[PDB]
Design an enzyme around this catalytic site. Structure first.
Site, mmCIF file in Angstrom:
data_model
loop_
_atom_site.group_PDB
_atom_site.id
_atom_site.type_symbol
_atom_site.label_atom_id
_atom_site.label_comp_id
_atom_site.label_asym_id
_atom_site.label_seq_id
_atom_site.Cartn_x
_atom_site.Cartn_y
_atom_site.Cartn_z
ATOM 1 N N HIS A 247 0.868 -1.184 0.000
ATOM 2 C CA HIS A 247 0.000 0.000 0.000
ATOM 3 C C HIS A 247 0.905 1.235 0.000
ATOM 4 O O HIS A 247 2.026 1.185 0.498
ATOM 5 C CB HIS A 247 -0.945 0.016 1.221
ATOM 6 C CG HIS A 247 -0.392 0.713 2.434
ATOM 7 N ND1 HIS A 247 0.293 0.049 3.428
ATOM 8 C CD2 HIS A 247 -0.450 2.012 2.817
ATOM 9 C CE1 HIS A 247 0.633 0.909 4.374
ATOM 10 N NE2 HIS A 247 0.195 2.104 4.029
ATOM 11 N N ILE B 35 2.856 1.693 9.124
ATOM 12 C CA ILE B 35 3.154 1.363 10.519
ATOM 13 C C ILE B 35 3.539 -0.102 10.635
ATOM 14 O O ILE B 35 2.727 -0.959 10.293
ATOM 15 C CB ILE B 35 1.906 1.596 11.391
ATOM 16 C CG1 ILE B 35 1.554 3.080 11.399
ATOM 17 C CG2 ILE B 35 2.127 1.064 12.789
ATOM 18 C CD1 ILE B 35 0.365 3.431 12.279
ATOM 19 N N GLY C 140 2.529 -5.032 14.614
ATOM 20 C CA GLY C 140 2.895 -5.521 15.925
ATOM 21 C C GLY C 140 3.418 -6.940 15.870
ATOM 22 O O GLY C 140 4.296 -7.324 16.649
ATOM 23 N N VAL C 141 2.879 -7.716 14.938
ATOM 24 C CA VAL C 141 3.270 -9.106 14.768
ATOM 25 C C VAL C 141 4.702 -9.294 14.258
ATOM 26 O O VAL C 141 5.404 -10.210 14.706
ATOM 27 C CB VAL C 141 2.270 -9.833 13.844
ATOM 28 C CG1 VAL C 141 2.924 -11.011 13.174
ATOM 29 C CG2 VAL C 141 1.084 -10.312 14.662
ATOM 30 N N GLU D 12 8.392 -11.127 15.906
ATOM 31 C CA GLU D 12 9.294 -11.932 15.065
ATOM 32 C C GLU D 12 10.727 -11.403 15.223
ATOM 33 O O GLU D 12 11.645 -12.144 15.563
ATOM 34 C CB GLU D 12 8.890 -11.836 13.585
ATOM 35 C CG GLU D 12 9.877 -12.490 12.621
ATOM 36 C CD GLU D 12 9.864 -14.002 12.699
ATOM 37 O OE1 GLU D 12 10.897 -14.625 12.362
ATOM 38 O OE2 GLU D 12 8.817 -14.566 13.080
#
Lengths: 118, 126
Positions: free
Chosen positions: B40, B46, B49-50, B54
């Site tokens: 995009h 941003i 969070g995932v 990692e």
């Protein structure tokens, strides 16, 4: 459905109680760029499903998560089956807590005790 | 300087400190041209969070590696406080908790401010 992660990981969904949806993994998988479906992307997959519920039960952000266990890897050709159950939605604070499970041909590939959204 | 990774992309640009079987401190420079961003255009990219647990999981293992295959098994108590943006420098740190014949905690900051917490990452063998 708001996601800070670029791609939606639920092919299709098949109120205030539970949701089920699918995702067939493939060789395409736009989730990298140039092979297995990383465990954290499964966390992302269940978390987008959960919000579809929350949204059918008003902006919401994946706030936290705990109780995640990846039993088996998810491979291309695997159809991921996901279910998220609503636990509580206290508008008092505006906190929702879901629970999620992932299957691959009837087997559990990943468990999630609670997923928080606000 | 590479070692095994579950995810296709290494989310650690540099380790700036390490004491075996104990703790480590690496860092990552959020580029505008990262894979997880490409998906995009111009608005508010941003970092997910995932992909933060990692980066921190990759960092936590490098510690297990310096302390036999370590497979990221599960995770508990992950709280996402602040959003990480491009240009920010994510400062991570993980501490060994146990090696039950593995478990570690991890924190990520941006300018000394906590942006994510993980009470526990579980790593199995083979």
């Amino acid at each position: 459905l708001p996601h800070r992660y670029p791609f939606l990981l639920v092919d299709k969904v098949i109120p205030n109680k539970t949701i089920i949806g699918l995702k067939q993994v493939s060789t395409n998988e736009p989730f990298f760029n140039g092979q297995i479906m990383p465990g954290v992307l499964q966390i992302e997959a269940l978390a987008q499903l959960a919000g579809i519920l929350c949204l059918k039960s008003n902006l919401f952000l994946f706030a936290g998560v705990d109780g995640v266990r990846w039993k088996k890897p998810v491979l291309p050709g695997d159809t991921l089956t996901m279910q998220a159950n609503l636990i509580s939605f206290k508008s008092s604070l505006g906190i929702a807590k879901l629970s999620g499970v992932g299957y691959v041909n009837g087997k559990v590939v990943i468990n999630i005790s609670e997923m928080t959204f606000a």
